[PDB]
Enzyme design. Sequence first.
Site, mmCIF file in Angstrom:
data_model
loop_
_atom_site.group_PDB
_atom_site.id
_atom_site.type_symbol
_atom_site.label_atom_id
_atom_site.label_comp_id
_atom_site.label_asym_id
_atom_site.label_seq_id
_atom_site.Cartn_x
_atom_site.Cartn_y
_atom_site.Cartn_z
ATOM 1 N N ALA A 99 33.560 50.680 15.846
ATOM 2 C CA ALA A 99 32.708 51.533 16.666
ATOM 3 C C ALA A 99 33.253 52.944 16.860
ATOM 4 O O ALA A 99 32.611 53.740 17.555
ATOM 5 C CB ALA A 99 32.475 50.889 18.036
ATOM 6 N N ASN A 228 50.993 42.351 26.248
ATOM 7 C CA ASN A 228 50.099 41.201 26.156
ATOM 8 C C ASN A 228 50.783 39.917 26.615
ATOM 9 O O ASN A 228 50.156 39.078 27.273
ATOM 10 C CB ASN A 228 49.571 41.061 24.728
ATOM 11 C CG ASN A 228 48.717 42.243 24.308
ATOM 12 O OD1 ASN A 228 48.361 43.088 25.130
ATOM 13 N ND2 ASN A 228 48.384 42.308 23.024
ATOM 14 N N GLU A 254 33.969 27.932 41.488
ATOM 15 C CA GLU A 254 34.867 28.075 42.630
ATOM 16 C C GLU A 254 35.517 29.452 42.681
ATOM 17 O O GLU A 254 35.842 29.935 43.771
ATOM 18 C CB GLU A 254 35.939 26.989 42.603
ATOM 19 C CG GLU A 254 36.338 26.502 43.984
ATOM 20 C CD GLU A 254 37.334 25.368 43.932
ATOM 21 O OE1 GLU A 254 37.119 24.435 43.136
ATOM 22 O OE2 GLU A 254 38.332 25.410 44.683
#
Lengths: 437, 54, 427, 316
Positions: A99, A228, A254
């Site tokens: 992109a 990471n 939850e």
Amino acid sequence: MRECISIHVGQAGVQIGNACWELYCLEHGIQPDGQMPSDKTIGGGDDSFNTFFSETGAGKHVPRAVFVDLEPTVIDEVRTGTYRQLFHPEQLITGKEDAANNYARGHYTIGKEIIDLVLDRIRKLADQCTGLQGFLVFHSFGGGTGSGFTSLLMERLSVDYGKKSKLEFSIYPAPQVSTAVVEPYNSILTTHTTLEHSDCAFMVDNEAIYDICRRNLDIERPTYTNLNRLISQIVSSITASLRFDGALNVDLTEFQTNLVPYPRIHFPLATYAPVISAEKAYHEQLSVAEITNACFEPANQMVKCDPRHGKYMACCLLYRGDVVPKDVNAAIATIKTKRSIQFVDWCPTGFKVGINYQPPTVVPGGDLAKVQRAVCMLSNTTAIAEAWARLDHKFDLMYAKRAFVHWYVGEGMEEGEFSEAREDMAALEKDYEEVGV
Amino acid sequence: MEVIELNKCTSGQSFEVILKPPSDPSLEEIQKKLEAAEERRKYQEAELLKHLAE
Amino acid sequence: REIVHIQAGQCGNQIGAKFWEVISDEHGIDPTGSYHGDSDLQLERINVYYNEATGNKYVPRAILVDLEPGTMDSVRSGPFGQIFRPDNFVFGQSGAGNNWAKGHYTEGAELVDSVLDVVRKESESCDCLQGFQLTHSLGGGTGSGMGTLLISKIREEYPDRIMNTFSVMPSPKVSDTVVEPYNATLSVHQLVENTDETYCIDNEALYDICFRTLKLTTPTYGDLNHLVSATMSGVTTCLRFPGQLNADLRKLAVNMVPFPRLHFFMPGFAPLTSRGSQQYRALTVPELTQQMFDSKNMMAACDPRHGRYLTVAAIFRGRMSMKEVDEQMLNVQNKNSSYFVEWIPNNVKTAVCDIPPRGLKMSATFIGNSTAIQELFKRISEQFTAMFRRKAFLHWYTGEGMDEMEFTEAESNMNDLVSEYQQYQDA
Amino acid sequence: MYTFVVRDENSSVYAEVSRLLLATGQWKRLRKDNPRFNLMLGERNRLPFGRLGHEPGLVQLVNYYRGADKLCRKASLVKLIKTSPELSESCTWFPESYVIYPREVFLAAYNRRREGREGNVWILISSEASELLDFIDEVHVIQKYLEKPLLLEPGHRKFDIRSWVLVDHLYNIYLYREGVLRTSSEPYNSLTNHCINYGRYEEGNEMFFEEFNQYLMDALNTTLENSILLQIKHIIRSCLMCIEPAISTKHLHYQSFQLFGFDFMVDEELKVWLIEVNGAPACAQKLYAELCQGIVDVAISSVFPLATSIFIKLHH
Ligand SMILES: Nc1nc2c(ncn2[C@@H]2O[C@H](COP(=O)(O)OP(=O)(O)OP(=O)(O)O)[C@@H](O)[C@H]2O)c(=O)[nH]1
Ligand SMILES: Nc1ncnc2c1ncn2[C@@H]1O[C@H](COP(=O)(O)OP(=O)(O)CP(=O)(O)O)[C@@H](O)[C@H]1O
Ligand SMILES: COc1cc(C(=O)c2cnc(-c3c[nH]c4ccccc34)[nH]2)cc(OC)c1OC
Ligand SMILES: Nc1nc2c(ncn2[C@@H]2O[C@H](COP(=O)(O)OP(=O)(O)O)[C@@H](O)[C@H]2O)c(=O)[nH]1
Ligand SMILES: [Ca+2]
Ligand SMILES: [Mg+2]
Ligand SMILES: [Mg+2]
């Protein structure tokens, strides 16, 4: 047992997904070839770890995950990496050209050509789930794919799986590890488009992770691998309730109940302690009181902000290691005396605590030392809106001159979508202020 | 203060501690949006080729 | 992602031949076209500029164009002349005569389709084609007139591919003809509209650097093109060598070009090095950073302190501490905040490549989109208007069918471009 | 070189501070919205605190403490004192004050003394609650007016004291050795704002510490340190430490200092009372140069060094 599907979009989502699934395999005793000798039910089961892994007749344990990127470079390393056998070839979806750091190109021109294929690959995962609860989507704000395509996928997932919960792990852009100047644009566009389609989003500021690696891991120039692996520890803490036996945060529903009282205000702050270097020879193991008190230090949060100048709507404490409730409660009483913890008046001043006795797992050859106890705090505080103000101000500086807007309008986008996205951001900031003061 | 809903198992335990009490678009419109950007992108392309033809 | 290289005219083919000469050495490719290098990094992204031929032979994806056979027969005679594919020599016979009109409208019109046939054949064998790289001058006729005609033709056939040029601008200090301001003004009108990135290589700056900084008293074109070749190698480092940015022609345009027509870049290099003269002391990371932003290292004769930086890209080459490069690059922005626009945050990007250029252990290449480039366009404009108000030398162009109105339009468009750079200097 | 930016052009104090920094030759003022600054002399309202401390390679300091407004607003200060156990319900040094919004707490305690004949004169100063309370409806703080102010002669003149306090990034608490006495020129009848005769007894209705010391000696056989300043140091220190966990920037990504103005009134029995704290104060004209250089010395140059003090360190 209800299954969860993980979707990793763009470079950041894919590489963070790699470290997460690597950590999951170590935590669950799954080998890089997919075998789990721990699993005595061969070919299937409904265990807690089966929420994230499916079983084959040959005993191979396969992540319930899909990796998508508009360009093949990053996912190709997954195809050739340590965990090649872990994933089915169809699980890894790649485009041909990316992109180019453009939300419009990821969302409209290039994204529309691959969206249908991705949903079908996702549908193949859903048809092997007896009871799908929802999706966990890992992506960046900054990249063209992580921004434009993610918002496109989230819209279609809302249509196709409207009853299912969708959670995000979002990477907030930081100049220290930046890839593009238009990342404030991409951040605002994708947040605006995805806002109602996401039930809970965990923002990770790359600036916070970067400083934590430098300060607490003594890495002068942290790489994506360093960031990471630390991010995966926090993610593993947040998702451990789904993959292990417990009473707290056992389904995606939850998470919204405990963390998100209002739908638009669905970005909880994450704080993690302790982060200690493996290379530290002499280290003194920190107590329950010390790690819990660290949860209120901004230097340990995933986003730098001041919770003292905000209000809490919810607070969760997720412990791993040698922790018993009496130490937790004694520590909380101590912290309450010394720190500024103020809740909104329509919420009780209380903490939801979960404890897993097995201490955090670390990858061999990693940077983090093994600790005897750790905690990840999830608090929904209005202070996280400081990140929205920072981003929105950067958006305003460029947009006031329409700098780079021609790149987006060149792909079919209109100038009005920019202002529409920014107005929604301005409204989001005002909602945070009303609740916070 | 008050410790509530203590649940235990061999993996760990969980509980709540309370210190004080309290005082979507369809597939259709998705495609309308995407095709409307596509016509703008195709129109701007046709203007280019028209200008090049001049 | 592959790039198609095109060199047109005398100046374009010369710097083009030097560029292939320089980067082939960097990638370990000999004049036979065979790889005889010591690292796999040289080949990791070799497909960007080279085609693979039988027996593991590497061929530049390059097309050589001129209306005169002479300078191209020189290229074949040159050190690396046999590396090029023979079918990619496309030449006329008459020549352009330093006439933009001949290159664009008459003599060049006959040859343009033959070039596009070669460009098409090179494009068809590309897995993912990023776009086109053109080297030419704007003061002559072929590279100026026909080079811009080719750019317009290529954009028509490849509207979604990036167009990138290395454009050498005329200077009266290095001047072949009085009509170079006419040719340059007509060329800039084309480049303002049919290129994505243009590196402004000012012959005035190249001359001044050779005279003042390299103490060369009478610099030749060989001296000038030594500076151009080093700059072109540095500017293409991210394309040719692997990095963390995963860099391409489009992302460069997206990040560097806030407004579509303001895409004219000021290249810079350091250490400024004369041909043959050996540099024994490597530079310090602080020295590279101060020199690379020094006005005396710019390849366009503009004062960066007379305008403001919209965007900057810095490429460091060699073994050095990336922490120091970060600190030093952060130091310049923080020290000189006034010359960077505040309304584009984080507008300076830094990249590092381990492999250094030949003959240096440390090198830095600078690419800036500064509003000070309006000085260069103002200079061409003034020289243009000086002749045009008297309609001097126009007959050369009206004899080829051009009308005065086309000159008035090109003059008006360039003055529009100058005013746009002026607008963002005070924004 | 250091960078700084000005965002409050009406700050007499920091306009003086900025001119001092430029004249050091090692500081450079930037454009008001340039993010790459070392120091920010920020606006008084909606200061963008969430934007500080996110510039790589930049140590950032700011001349305001986020959250200090809780000490510098009458309604919040009055709340802060009664609700905080450090200031411990009704401490001795703050007048009885109540938050009434344009009520129940006022009537209960006040009416006891209108019955008991002890002077009931709260404060726009009245003795009838309805007269002043219903008037304010045309937030506000209802405070007891101390009816026995300290006599100051020659002139029978009521007064108030202002001490300037600098708190640095390390939360050192600095009391400027030169305080100011603002004097009412007209006698008292059984407000001292210099904004509201003038010049009769001393210049511009400003009396200083060397002078007021001798008056206290000759008239009252006592020292300024022993009679008043000991109480002042205790009130400043108690206030600023109570809010230290809420506003300290010790472990923050940006740093804060801030100059305050404390206001006291001394009663007949030489008891010191806290009037108000001002987050944006203006120095006395004579003292500007000394104080603004002390700010640079201890607040700015401490973080940004170059290449006998005027302050009292209030220890905690
Ligand atoms: N924490 C972390 N951040 C990353 C990582 N990779 C990229 N980023 C951040 O993500 C932003 C850019 O997004 P990318 O994921 O690289 O772009 P993309 O999603 O692949 O989209 P394209 O533009 O088409 O390439 C920048 O802010 C980077 O700092 C990563 O591995 N870890
Ligand atoms: N309980 C009290 N008893 C006697 N006088 C009082 C008083 N409370 C306030 N005052 C007087 O009111 C005057 C001004 O009122 P206030 O204390 O609210 O503002 P201030 O003195 O800090 C000046 P500014 O508001 O401009 O900063 C003071 O000088 C003080 O003498
Ligand atoms: C085409 O060759 C390059 C490509 C790139 C590139 O693809 C790129 C990707 N992202 C960015 C930027 C992100 N923020 C910026 C601010 C200023 C300038 C560039 C950026 N550039 C960068 C280069 O030089 C660093 C290149 O060498 C000239
Ligand atoms: N650096 C460099 N510049 C040249 C060279 N040859 C010509 N020039 C410059 O280019 C302009 C002349 O254009 P030229 O390329 O010779 O004409 P063309 O062959 O018709 O394109 C003049 O401004 C020259 O200064 C060269 O070899 N090297
Ligand atoms: Ca099983
Ligand atoms: Mg990418
Ligand atoms: Mg020539």
